[PDB]
Design a protein around this nucleic acid. Structure first.
Ligand SMILES: [Mg+2]
Ligand SMILES: [Mg+2]
Ligand SMILES: [Mg+2]
Ligand SMILES: [Mg+2]
Ligand SMILES: [Mg+2]
Ligand SMILES: [Mg+2]
Ligand SMILES: [Mg+2]
Ligand SMILES: [Mg+2]
Ligand SMILES: [Mg+2]
Ligand SMILES: [Mg+2]
Ligand SMILES: [Mg+2]
Ligand SMILES: [Mg+2]
Ligand SMILES: [Mg+2]
Ligand SMILES: [Mg+2]
Ligand SMILES: [Mg+2]
Ligand SMILES: [Mg+2]
Lengths: 137, 96, 76, 57
RNA sequence: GCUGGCGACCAUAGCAAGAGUGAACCACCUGAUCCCUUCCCGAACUCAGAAGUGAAACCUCUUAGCGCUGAUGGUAGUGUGGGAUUACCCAUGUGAGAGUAAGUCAUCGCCAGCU
RNA sequence: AGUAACGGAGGAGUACGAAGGUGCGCUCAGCGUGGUCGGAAAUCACGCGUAGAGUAUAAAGGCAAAAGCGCGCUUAACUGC
RNA sequence: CGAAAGCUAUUUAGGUAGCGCCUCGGACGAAUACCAUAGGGGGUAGAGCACUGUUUCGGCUAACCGAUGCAAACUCCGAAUACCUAUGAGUACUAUCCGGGAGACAGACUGCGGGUGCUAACGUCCGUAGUCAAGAGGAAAACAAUCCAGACCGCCAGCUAAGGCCCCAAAAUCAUAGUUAAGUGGGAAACGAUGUGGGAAGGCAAGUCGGCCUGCGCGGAAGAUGUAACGGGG
């Protein structure tokens, strides 16, 4: 399960998730990519699940590029405790997803098989996705 | 040989609200610069430009832009696409 | 039980007199921890880097030198 | 010169403090009240702050 | 037309690479006796010099090569009024950062000497 | 400017007659090379890009007229304000 | 005429004191505020990767190079607002100072910016604006805190606001052009599907094929006294 090897701080303010993904939204490594059309969180378990599904369908061919990395920690409180007494404990890690961001990219496959694998993986994600190909300007 | 039939985009049609009104009726803003003349703001038709952007030869040879008895020989320089939908939003054209 | 819960009392640092204002000799212009602003003409610097006016005039900020420093000065 | 007539249209009781002061600084007292003011930039500024509850002819 | 000093300004003014100068000025250069130095050393700081050379340096000229500067148009954000509630939409005012076209091998003041 | 929570992270309850004043003076760290032990690192000598070194002590704001580092002489770590 | 439910301290925490906020008297009148113009300093929103950290793929021999992301306690950058000063128009018993008398220091909800919690709570803690408190009238069926609006008294007079005009119940069974067949309207997701209206394109030769973008609908859809998820009739 992906997570940073070391961080400056353990705990992080909640924050809000607004705007669009202007930066990581262009195919830059392969031929075909899957993109988020909605916003949400993506835990490390979902990242690994979709990676396994894609690489199982693709028959270990081509290459898969993961372009999302989960680096924001999320805390929780233990069960049956009251509302004060400090911040909880880190339980898992997420990546924030704004609409437009490329999640996965595939290389070295004809588009039909890539689309079958992407349709398999889009069923294990919490938000709506789309498929995109490379283009010049 | 490609040709995009444009129309003039004066002030009070430039800005953020004016450009959103333009796009809400399927038109695309654009700018033409280069050479020794001043830039020229322009409005193109979205379906025309979408149709042109599917041919790989449109990105290489000289395109003709007609803003009304005024023909310009330009190459496409930059393009802004929407991040979620791939809809083009702005196009830059260098006088060539 | 946690290990946090401390802080200091405030210090009220900042610019007290702005550009174009008149000042008497002695008025404090800037309270700063370091030297974000430097002393120009008719301005002195205290032991805690306080910039104060040493003549009557009008305050003015600028940027000067080969290090691009911020200066404040008093015009009489 | 230039003079304009301004009428208060909506209520002014739950507006921002400066929006109530803009109406008080033009001479307007209640809904339907109409006053005649000079057409200076300083009057136009107050008229521009409260465009949503006044009518200018 | 080549200089020396003191400033304004602080890269469109800077680094790189190349080329040029020795009347004058400046620099290297000679000797350490005296003045004056070196936690050792005339290296540097000094003093008395004038056989040399423009080698190093400095200074002035060339080229965007690296840097620096930089629109227009669009996009993000946003005050006020209204509508929606996952953070948007409409009216009105405002408006970046990044990126693109393009620009730069400096401008000026006071003084002294040389031709 | 100020601004709360059994909100998120760190320090203090000292040190120094020089680690204070002053005149004069200096410039870090990092790398490559050639050098007896001696090696990746002691001490030299020479080069190219450099603020990434330091500050008695936590962090921040600062630091070329260096506020960093030395040497001689000194007590302004004065009294009234 | 008209508050506060705050700040600071307290063997203080449901008490009290100074300051803030109300009222009366005196002095003094433009010093005051709103707006325009002019002069200022920011490090937030956004963005970026120059530092501090962290992330992906490649090249070369941990580090350098190329391409690629992220940040409350990163910043080469950087607003809108807000705040401070001077000048000016118009409109306002404005602002200051000196005395007598206080109450109050349990707040609540709604919107915007956040911390905490599960981006749970009619939860809890701050900032900022509105209402209630201490505010009646009209609308939201009924409904402190929402929308419109601030009640000196009287009238069997008139115009409007929010919201409405088939009947209960005042006013259009009004006019023009469309969509829906689900009582959708009048409660709810991933996902499923030849429902139906519109649009920009393609392949093949009486047309046919399947693909995208869209308006409105369908399934997904189980609870306990009585229909009971339009107030009702309809
Ligand atoms: Mg707008
Ligand atoms: Mg712009
Ligand atoms: Mg710009
Ligand atoms: Mg009253
Ligand atoms: Mg109390
Ligand atoms: Mg009084
Ligand atoms: Mg941000
Ligand atoms: Mg209390
Ligand atoms: Mg409160
Ligand atoms: Mg509550
Ligand atoms: Mg009460
Ligand atoms: Mg009421
Ligand atoms: Mg009522
Ligand atoms: Mg009622
Ligand atoms: Mg009736
Ligand atoms: Mg009819």
């Amino acid at each position: 399960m992906l997570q940073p090897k070391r961080t400056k701080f353990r705990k992080v303010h909640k924050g809000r998730n607004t705007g669009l993904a202007h930066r990581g939204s262009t195919v830059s490594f392969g031929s075909i990519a899957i993109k988020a059309t909605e916003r949400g969180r993506m835990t490390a378990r979902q990242i690994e699940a979709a990676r396994r599904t894609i690489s199982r369908r693709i028959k270990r061919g081509g290459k898969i590029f993961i372009r999302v990395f989960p680096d924001k920690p999320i805390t929780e409180k233990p069960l049956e405790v009251r509302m004060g007494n400090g911040k909880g404990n880190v339980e898992y890690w997420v990546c924030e997803i704004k609409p437009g961001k490329i999640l996965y990219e595939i290389e070295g496959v004809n588009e039909d098989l890539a689309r079958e694998a992407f349709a398999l993986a889009a069923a294990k994600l919490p938000f709506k996705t789309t498929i995109v190909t490379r283009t010049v300007m | 040989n490609f040709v995009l039939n444009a129309q003039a985009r004066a002030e009070d049609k430039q800005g953020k609200g004016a450009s959103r009104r333009l796009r809400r009726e399927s038109l695309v803003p654009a700018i033409i610069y280069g050479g020794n003349a001043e830039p020229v703001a322009v409005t193109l038709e979205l379906r025309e430009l979408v149709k042109a952007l599917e041919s790989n030869a449109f990105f290489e040879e000289v395109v003709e832009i007609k803003v009304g008895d005024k023909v310009e020989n330009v190459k496409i320089q930059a393009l802004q696409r929407h991040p979620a939908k791939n809809t083009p939003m702005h196009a830059d054209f260098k006088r060539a | 039980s946690t290990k946090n819960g401390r802080d200091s009392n405030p210090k009220m640092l900042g610019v007290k007199v702005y550009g174009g204002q008149t000042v008497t000799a002695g008025n404090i212009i800037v309270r700063q921890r370091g030297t974000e602003f430097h002393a120009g003409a008719n301005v002195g610097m205290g032991r805690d880097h306080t910039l104060f006016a040493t003549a009557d005039g009008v305050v003015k900020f600028e940027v000067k030198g080969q290090f691009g420093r911020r200066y404040v000065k008093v015009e009489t | 010169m230039k003079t304009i007539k301004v009428t208060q249209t909506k209520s002014s009781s739950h507006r921002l403090k400066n929006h109530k002061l803009c109406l008080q600084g033009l001479g307007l007292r209640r809904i339907g009240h109409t006053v005649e003011v000079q057409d200076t930039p300083s009057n136009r500024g107050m008229i521009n702050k409260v465009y949503y509850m006044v009518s200018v002819e």
